Amino acid sequence: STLFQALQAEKNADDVSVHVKTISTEDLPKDGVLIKVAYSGINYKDGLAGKAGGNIVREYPLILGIDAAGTVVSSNDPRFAEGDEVIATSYELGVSRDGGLSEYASVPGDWLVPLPQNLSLKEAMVYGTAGFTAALSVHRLEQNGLSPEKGSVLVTGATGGVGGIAVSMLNKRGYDVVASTGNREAADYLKQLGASEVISREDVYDGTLKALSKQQWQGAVDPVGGKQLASLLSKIQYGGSVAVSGLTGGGEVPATVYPFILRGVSLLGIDSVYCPMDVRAAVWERMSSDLKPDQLLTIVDREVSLEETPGALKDILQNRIQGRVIVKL
Amino acid sequence: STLFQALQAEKNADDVSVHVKTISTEDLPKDGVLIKVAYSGINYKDGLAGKAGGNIVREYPLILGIDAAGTVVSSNDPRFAEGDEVIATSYELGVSRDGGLSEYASVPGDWLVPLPQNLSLKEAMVYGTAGFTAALSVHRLEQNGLSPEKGSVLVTGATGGVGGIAVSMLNKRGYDVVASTGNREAADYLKQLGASEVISREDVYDGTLKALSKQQWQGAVDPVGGKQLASLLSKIQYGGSVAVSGLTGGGEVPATVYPFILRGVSLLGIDSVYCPMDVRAAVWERMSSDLKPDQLLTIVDREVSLEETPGALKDILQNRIQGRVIVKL
Amino acid sequence: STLFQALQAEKNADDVSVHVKTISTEDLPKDGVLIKVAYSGINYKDGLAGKAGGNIVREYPLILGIDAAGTVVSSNDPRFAEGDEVIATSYELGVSRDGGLSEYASVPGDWLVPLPQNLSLKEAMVYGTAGFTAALSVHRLEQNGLSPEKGSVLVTGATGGVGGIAVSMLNKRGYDVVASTGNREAADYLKQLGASEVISREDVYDGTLKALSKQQWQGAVDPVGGKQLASLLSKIQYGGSVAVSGLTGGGEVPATVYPFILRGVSLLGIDSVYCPMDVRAAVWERMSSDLKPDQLLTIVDREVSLEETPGALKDILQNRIQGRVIVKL
Amino acid sequence: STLFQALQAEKNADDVSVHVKTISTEDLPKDGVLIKVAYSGINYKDGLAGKAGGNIVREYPLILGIDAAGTVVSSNDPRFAEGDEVIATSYELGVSRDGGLSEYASVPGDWLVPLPQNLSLKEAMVYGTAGFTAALSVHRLEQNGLSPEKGSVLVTGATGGVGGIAVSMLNKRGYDVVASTGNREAADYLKQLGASEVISREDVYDGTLKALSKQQWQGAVDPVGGKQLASLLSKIQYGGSVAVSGLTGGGEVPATVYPFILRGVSLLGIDSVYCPMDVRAAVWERMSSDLKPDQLLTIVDREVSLEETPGALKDILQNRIQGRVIVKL
Amino acid sequence: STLFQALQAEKNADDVSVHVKTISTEDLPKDGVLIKVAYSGINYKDGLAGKAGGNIVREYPLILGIDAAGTVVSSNDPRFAEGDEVIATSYELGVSRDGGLSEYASVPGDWLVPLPQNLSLKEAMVYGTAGFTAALSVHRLEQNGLSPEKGSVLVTGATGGVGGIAVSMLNKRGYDVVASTGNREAADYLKQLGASEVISREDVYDGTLKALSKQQWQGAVDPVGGKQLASLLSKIQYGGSVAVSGLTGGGEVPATVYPFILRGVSLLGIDSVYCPMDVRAAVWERMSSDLKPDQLLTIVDREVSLEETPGALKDILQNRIQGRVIVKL
Amino acid sequence: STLFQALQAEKNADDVSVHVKTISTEDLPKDGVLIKVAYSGINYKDGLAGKAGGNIVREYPLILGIDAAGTVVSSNDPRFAEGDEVIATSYELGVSRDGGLSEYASVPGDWLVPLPQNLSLKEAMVYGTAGFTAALSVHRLEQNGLSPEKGSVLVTGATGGVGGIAVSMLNKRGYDVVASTGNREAADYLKQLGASEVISREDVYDGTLKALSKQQWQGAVDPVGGKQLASLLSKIQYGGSVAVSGLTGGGEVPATVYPFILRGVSLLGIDSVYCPMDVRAAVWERMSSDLKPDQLLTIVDREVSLEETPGALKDILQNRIQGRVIVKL
């Protein structure tokens, strides 16, 4: 039916390759809605998909992806019509099914999110999965008591994907943001995203940890897990909460029971991969209103092309990239 | 200005009093609202307030408490009138200031909750902090997605104060409850409190640990923290949550980030001590309707009586109480 | 088109007499929707409309009424349809426009309420205005914070039209109701309406009058008004409310500012004559559910024919009816 | 420790003094949160707590106050955290327990409200009791129908603490505000604050009482009380409301039942002292959005230090203040 | 009392004439509230009223209208006070009872809506009945799904009154509007109103009709309904709706059933004549905020005077009007 | 893996066959969630999918289906765990994708709905699609004004799955239901399902056609609309609503615009195939509460088994099936 470029990862023995192959429309999962991808996605999980030892993908070959945002061309699904702008993120995409890093994508109607009126196709990808994860985290924390005045809100691993955006959204909602990173010299760019304060990894965790510490924060959007979350928990304000998104040193969390039962703190698991659609559609409205930051264009490091995509996959992973990479198809 | 039987704790030497003395109204702290207690409990926290330095009471002649319900006799407080029935619970009662359990108590107006309409004073102290802790637990899990079709809800430490009632409230709300205990024998009592099933402590955790296990429960009310809690977070279904309220079974929780960030589960700290007035009111309101189980009295391991107090302040501390013990006066 | 009987009020020099004549539907008002009236409406305001010096009817041949319920026979306005069961009450009915002591009445569609599903036509007029007044007072009191548990509710002139139903509506709701009247045999009649205790007119005013008194109530449904309002206002609990409605008891009310400003009580005027259609229908709804008292028919003193109506229009007024007289057309 | 400068009132047998005395932390009651006061406040109630036989201060050396905004500085209340910004108002402050006309105070935790995000500490006190009372008035009126289109709203006592502010709140929401005052001269000022029309005292009450006058406001905010409020009551549109809060120009209100029963009007009591935490905190949120007037600094008569306060508590009384008097620490 | 001007329609033996007559307030229906009309309104249903065989006005005397907005001059009706601004529209006005084209109208207090705060009288009548019909139409779409992301919205008959206001309002909500009218270059005016796109009659419907077409829209506001409308229903996104309010394109609609049962589209009937006060007032609120377009006054063709009203009543009736003609008085 | 029985449509030659078969697990679509099916019906759509030129199934060797209520036997998708009861209906099941006339099915997760707490797998299926479709018809009517009280409500085709059910359900909500059929001598079946009046099709249409008819209903659930719906549309009360859904009756609906623009009635299309998971889950919630009629199983004509299944497939079509037919598995 029509030929185009895609970014296809594949295994020869023990080893993951990744190159822009040229592919026909008839080859795609037939059974989704046919999308022409406007924009992009380069995400940490895509990098892992692209590399042996990543533990994301299980049979190759597979077109890489996880995030895409384009226009419906061809529907068999009455819910969607030609011309509709949609976002196709999460679920199986980019993991066990053809993904977004490609002109054209077939994805199930039941994962399409109708593009919010006040985000363009490219703003939707400046956001992507990180970004959704961030917005998701402020939504969960908000339904557990968070409000801009119960005190100051902590973003760990700011600077990374999720953290960088959460900094900005919190800041558009009017919370006081404290961002922590290991990289000095990131202070300026975190402030421009909205942080009114910048602290170190070490200001959040040092020598191990106790059950309860002086109250410092109220809540945290937390993309980094491990011993450091354990710590932070004990510095969270009464009734406060924490939203976890990542591992980044520490699958283990040696936590106590104390911040929980004495200070009423909650820890909210956040997974964007299977979030159900209604909540998904609601978080996206938000990301285009309530939570749409004034920078935003500032969180983009580079807009690269489908061609230039193997190299940018090698660059997150080797974290040589501040902010976000969108791909323009 | 009469005289009455409070229960008082003294540090004589270093081994801690617990004796049914006799006190003056003028000795009550003259800044409260005087209430004539009809009833009380008998909560674990009350047991430790009574032991050999159990890390609750730090100043030293003290009337034990935390739970009381009775009638205003005298208020300097525009907001309560003589004759009002009230509940007085939490906050400093029975920890840094004189407590329930003592016909006569002088509680600030701020901590008082009017007795809701469908609950008698006996019902109120049959619930106690134990039943307000379990109620706030359900209240809390409900704000995080909890719902009875979602799948069964585990109540851990069932039998105890908090678990015993949690099983009831769960069952009243129509969920399928799954109760754990340390003893065989329980079972019929748990089945008739509302359990639709009884499993042992080892079926929750003996296995010791594992990042993710098979999904078994929509969520849990867990009054028994410890390793046991770290194990159950791994058996919670997707977007499920767990409400920790107590410490039985250990301070430490060795958790992994992985049910949080891959399964979207949440873990919610439940503290009944400083919960805000509105939510306290709201939770009593539910406790008298919504969560009011038809058993109710079933949770009573007979009523006791002031003089009779040392006795139970003793059992508690060695779970030889099955459910709860109120105090008439 | 038809003849029918109505109870009409005639004046000449200056007596005003009230006889059942025979009208035709052709000399009903032609603008309104035509309605076969089923039941009643004997009210104290009709007694007044009936009598020189009543100061109710402005101008004089006029069919007495104010309340009516029946079935739309012939509508020239889309909103109502031959068959529809509907209530007609207040506004101009029975005051400056032909009312419903008549079988047939021509009312504007703007003023009919559809008959609630769980309330028959007889029940609607068993309530009437005196009912709708009482339900409104409850509705206005609850918007100002009233709730079954903030302390007892007083109903003055219980036995009256309004205090009767009000006593039963509050009790249907759960509130502890305390009723006051002038007569000493009414105790049981009033228990039997739902009163929890019964008190003299003097138990509320005797004492004549202090700025602030011992708090006793929470709030009141008051159809009596007068100096006794001024006293009742000062026995209201913190933030309680009172609903006014009548003056059977005086018009001057020597209030002082102290209960309002130091204790946050409020005085709500109930007028049903001009109450907005949206609230009218909300209250009729409550009147057919959550305010519908089990007792209800036990407030009917006597059904009467149109024939016996002059009979009874002299009987309210002569204040010799206990409860409500309903008229079957 | 350290030491700091309070404005303490003392009784010299009958003299009742008030002097800037130096006390120590160690002095302040020992059960609250230690707060460093930043700002002010001079209310009329505070003049009184100064003046002998003013009838407000209980027994009699205490630090005057009633209002304070400032910083939690250490706490044994888990609810608050060194650092947090808070507002301390009402309840016993500055009446039976030390107030905030002083650097340092110890308020209990249950009375503290977290400073809203879009108010500074100084803006908190620019309002004070006066402004909380204004905004609680509006909030209760709006709870009883008031809406900006249902006609003009009167505010009596404009140029006082409460009236002044209320004008500009009422205007901030879009109401058409009619402001009344005792002295000419102030029209310009009242309009800057956002009054649409300025009338005198005699325009409200000159003519002196009648039971129903010609309809003229919809509703009022009323600082003033006595027979004026009686007059003005008979001038309120169908279904409108008046909220009273002061007793300037008399504690007695010679009302009639007739605006209430015939026009459906309500009169609501505003107590600021003990209004519950709930509404208190919802009302301060409104005072930072919704009710935050663009002027707001226009109301500030001057800013004053702790020493010139003694001057100020004598001025507040026998009227001299136009607007509000802010104390800085 | 007074003499004033009014565009009255007379019919003698056979014709329907229409001119400015002098009339006196002693002739205006004696039952409703008296209003000194400030404005308008030229509606199509107005043209039919003042036209031989137009078949609206049943009986001639009458003074034409359907819309007006003005200032209460005197009232017997407690709900209205000499001075209020109000809008008076629909019900029997300009159809079977004296309407709004005059100084002076007498309208039943049950039909006045008070002017919302953000609408001047002029603006209320720029909108008028046809204006109210657009808001009401969107309001009902929005009750059936319609939301801006979900696709673009069509507006037939753009160019008239209803369609042109519909186009603005939808745009101010941020819909993508597709305005469709047959007056060909008119094009840029539809663009001043907020249309994103502009198509013609043939592109809605041409020759023919098919049960389902290619999906194109999502929703339509439809003042033109007829064969053109069966055509449009086959063209609407899954779960869309159309809000019909007019013939124009004629009154038969041969529709299938497939868009309804297969595609879940809905068709909403819009009547602004008898819509309840309730919704009416909610919709005038929207009109005055939410749905209030920036280029309101760009819909005003011309502002005529009562004199030059006869010419304009000809003018609608034949596609001579681009927008609306307002009348000033 | 294991193997099992299922009813399967093949088209050997050109005739379309339908026999019970032995399939294997390994032969189910392998990305769905694996449900062991407990029950199925029986829908018209299921009659057609297994009759040539029936025109539902486009590609044959399908498992027929469309409804299924089952148990997660093990899943690849983290949002379901084994033992979860679930309902699987609509979307592609049994039109495009193997359906529930099988023991065993592999429904994708996105389409599953947890079985509600107060329904049994048997119940879910007593309901199935046509049932869901009645449920959703009520949901939508209720979204458009339908309340018990606004008059009585029709249900055409009162004998099949959808209409039979909508009758029991409407009446469960308190509506005065009118049932219409052309099967005289069924009167009792209906009244027993809850019809309060029964009438012949001829009563609804017959009379051939007219634009505005005497108003008889308020609304109609119409499962059988066509030229009769057009008639019906002319007899709905002001603001009334009709819910479509079906098609015997003809697909052609030659309507007018007049019930729509003069009486403000509405046509709402009902489609159960693609309704969002959202609304769909919440409709299932009603179906087990709000709309769960006492009758229910009174609508099971008979419980059949897989074998008997082909004959049932043949029996719907010629109306020999009065209620609904379930299928044990």
User: Two tokens at A89?
Assistant: 């993120």
Measure in Å the smallest separation between the Cα of E205 and chain F Cα atoms: 17
D41: left (phi over 0), alpha (psi -120 to 50) or beta: left
| Rg of chain F in Å (alpha carbons) | 20
Distance between CA E42 and CA E44 in Å, rounded?
7
Q: Under the phi-then-psi rule, with left for phi > 0, alpha for psi from -120 to 50, and beta for the rest, what region is A317? A: left
The burial class, CB within 10 Å (0-12 / 13-18 / 19+), for D19 is: exposed
CA–CA separation, E188 and E191 (whole Å): 5
Residue A270 region by backbone torsions, left for phi larger than 0, else alpha for psi between -120 and 50, else beta: beta
Chains within contact range of chain D (3+ C-beta pairs < 8 Å): A, B, C, E
> How close, in Å, is residue E321 to chain C by CA atoms?
31
Neighbours of F, requiring at least 3 CB pairs below 8 Å, are: A, B, C, E
Interface of D with E (CB under 8 A): 148-151, 174, 214-216, 237-239, 262-263
The yes-or-no reply on F/D contact (3 CB pairs or more, < 8 Å) is no
* Residues in Cβ contact with C31 at an 8 Å cutoff, skipping those fewer than 6 apart: C106, C108, E31
Q: How far apart, in Å, are the Cα atoms of D164 and each of B24, D44, D128, D160, D226?
A: 50, 14, 13, 5, 19
Quote the tokens at residue E310: 């006869």
Our CA-based measurement puts residue B279 at a distance from the nearest CA of chain D, in whole angstroms, of 10
Q: Which two tokens stand for residue A256?
A: 């106590």
Closest partner residue to B274 (CB to CB) among D78, D271, D278 is D78
Q: Are E255 and F255 within 8 A, CB to CB?
A: yes
Q: Which two tokens stand for residue B254?
A: 């060795």
Cβ separation A81–E237 shorter than 8 A: yes
- ∠ CA E47-E324-F257, nearest 5°, is 60
Mutation target vs D (from B278, B279, B280, B285; most D CBs, 10 A cutoff): B278
Most C-contacting residue of F146, F147, F149, F213 (CB-CB within 10 A), to test interface: F149
Q: How far is CA D192 from CA D127, D162, D171, in A?
A: 17, 16, 11
SS (H, E, C) chain A: CCEEEECEECECCCCECCECCEEEHHHCCCCCEEEEEEECCECHHHHHHCCCCCCCCCCCCEECCCEEEEEECCCCCCCCCCCCEEEEECCCECCCECCCCECCEEECHHHEEECCCCCCHHHHHHHCHHHHHHHHHHHHHHCCCCCCCCCCEEECCCCCHHHHHHHHHHHHHCCCEEEECCCCCCHHHHHHCCCCEEECCCCCCCCCCCCCCCCCCCEEEECCCHHHHHHHHHCCCCCCEEEECCCCCCCEEEECCHHHHHHCCEEEECCCCCCCHHHHHHHHHHHCCCCCCCCCHHHEEEEEECCCHHHHHHHCCCCCCCCEEEEEC
Peptide bond into E61 cis (omega under 30): yes
CA distance D277 to chain B (A): 8
C-alpha C18/C-alpha C279 separation (Å) is 33
D1-128+295-329 placed in CATH 3.30.230.10: no
Residue C201 CB-density burial (10 A; 0-12 exposed, 13-18 middle, 19+ buried):
middle
Q: What are phi and psi of E113, to 5 degrees?
A: -115, 130
Q: Do chains D and B touch (3 or more CB pairs under 8 A)?
A: yes
- What's the Cα-to-Cα distance from C309 to each of C9, C10, C18, C63, F112, rounded to whole Å? 12, 15, 9, 12, 66
Tokens of E9: 């329609």
3-state secondary structure E297-314: HHHEEEEEEHHHHHHHHH
Could you give the C-alpha distances from C74 to C80, E45, E90, E95, in angstroms and in order?
9, 26, 22, 20
Cα–Cα distance, F178 to C271 (Å, whole number): 39
Token digits for E203? 């592109």
- Whether the upstream peptide bond of residue F78 has omega within 30° of 0, thus cis, is no
Quote the tokens at residue E319. Answer: 């596609």
D211 interaction partners in chain C (CB closer than 8 Å)? 251
Per the entry, the structure determination technique was X-ray
Partners of D214 on chain E (C-beta within 8 Å) are 81-82
Flag if A108 and F110 touch (Cβ within 8 Å). Answer: yes
The residues, any chain, with a CB within 8 Å of residue A206's CB and separated by 6 or more, are: none
CB contact under 8 A, C277 and E274: no
Q: Mutation test of the interface with chain A: which of B229, B266, B277, choosing the one with the most A Cβ atoms within 10 A?
A: B266
A interface toward E at CB cutoff 8 Å?
78-82, 84, 114-118
Residues in contact with F249: Cβ distance below 8 Å, sequence separation at least 6, in sequence order = F156, F157, F224, F225, F226, F227, F228, F229
Neighbouring C-alpha atoms within 13 Å toward the C-beta of E154: 33
CA quadruple B29, B35, B41, B43: dihedral, nearest 10: -40
Strand D219-222 with D153-155, pairing: parallel
Specify whether the CB–CB gap between A275 and B145 falls below 8 A. no
| Chain A residue numbers touching D78 (CB-CB < 8 A) | 238, 262-263
Do residue B81 and residue C148 have CB atoms under 8 angstroms apart? no
Q: Where does chain B break, by residue before each gap (C–N > 2.5 Å)?
A: none
CB contact under 8 A, B262 and F78: yes
Question: Which of F221, F236, F16, F20 has its CA nearest to residue F137?
Answer: F221
Nearest to E237 by CA among A72, F45, A36: A72
What residues contact E60, with CB distance under 8 A and at least 6 apart?
E9, E10, E11, E16
- What is the phi/psi pair of residue A189, to 5°? -70, -30
Chain F hits for B239, CB-CB cut-off 8 Å, are 79
Euclidean distance between CA atoms D220 and D226, whole angstroms? 14
Both structure tokens of A192 = 């421009």
Q: Of C142, C147, C149, C262, which to mutate for an interface test with B (greatest number of B Cβ within 10 Å)?
A: C149
**Binding-site sequence positions of C for NADP(+):** 44, 159-162, 181-183, 201, 247, 261, 272, 319
Angle separating helix axes D161-172 and D121-142, nearest 10 degrees: 70
Cα(D180)–Cα(D159) distance, rounded to whole angstroms?
9
Query: Could you give the count of Cα atoms lying within 13 Å of B208 in the half-sphere of its Cβ?
Result: 1
* d(C-alpha B29, C-alpha B96), whole Å: 12
3-state secondary structure of B304: strand
- Of all residues in chain E, the one with the smallest CA distance to C96 is E31
Return the CATH architecture of domain B129-294.
3-Layer(aba) Sandwich (3.40)
**Rounded distance, CA F113 to CA A245, Å?**
27
- Residue in E closest to F223 by C-alpha: E261
- CB neighbourhood size of F150 (10 A): 20
Neighbours of chain A (3+ CB pairs under 8 A): B, D, E, F
Which among E149, E214, E215 has the least Cβ separation from residue A116? E149
H helix or E strand, kind and range, residue E207: none
Residue D155 to residues C266, D159, D233, Cα–Cα distance (Å):
18, 10, 13
- Residue of A245, A266, A270, A278 best to disrupt the B interface, most CBs of B under 10 A: A266
Instruction: Tell me the sheet residues that pair with D39.
Output: D69, D328
Rounded to the nearest angstrom, the minimum Cα separation between E269 and chain A is 25
Which of D246, D257, D265 has the CB atom closest to C261's CB atom?
Answer: D246
Q: Quick one: which of C21, C122, C94, C115 has its CA closest to C273?
A: C94
Closest CA to B165 of B199, B206, B201, B124: B124
- What residue in A sits closest to E151 (Cα-Cα)? A84
Q: Domain segments of chain F: what residues?
A: 1-128+295-329, 129-294
Structure tokens at B246: 């107590």
3-class secondary structure, D34: strand
Encoding tokens for residue F151? 């008059």
Q: Which residue has 């105070």 as its token pair?
A: D105
- Interruptions in chain E after residues (C–N over 2.5 Å): none
Checking DSSP bridges between strand F266-268 and strand F241-243, what pairing results, if any? parallel
Angstroms from D244 CA to nearest CA on chain C = 7
**Residue E118, annotated as binding a ligand:** no
Nearest residue to D61 via CA among D98, D103, D22 = D98
Q: The tokens of B116 are what?
A: 């809701």
Quick check: F229 and E267 in contact, CB under 8 A?
no
C-alpha B113/C-alpha B119 separation (Å) is 12
D92 → chain B, closest CA residue:
B77
Q: Which residues of E touch A115 (CB under 8 A)?
A: 149
Cβ of C225 within 8 Å of Cβ of D255? The answer is no
Q: Are B297 and B126 in contact (CB under 8 A)?
A: yes
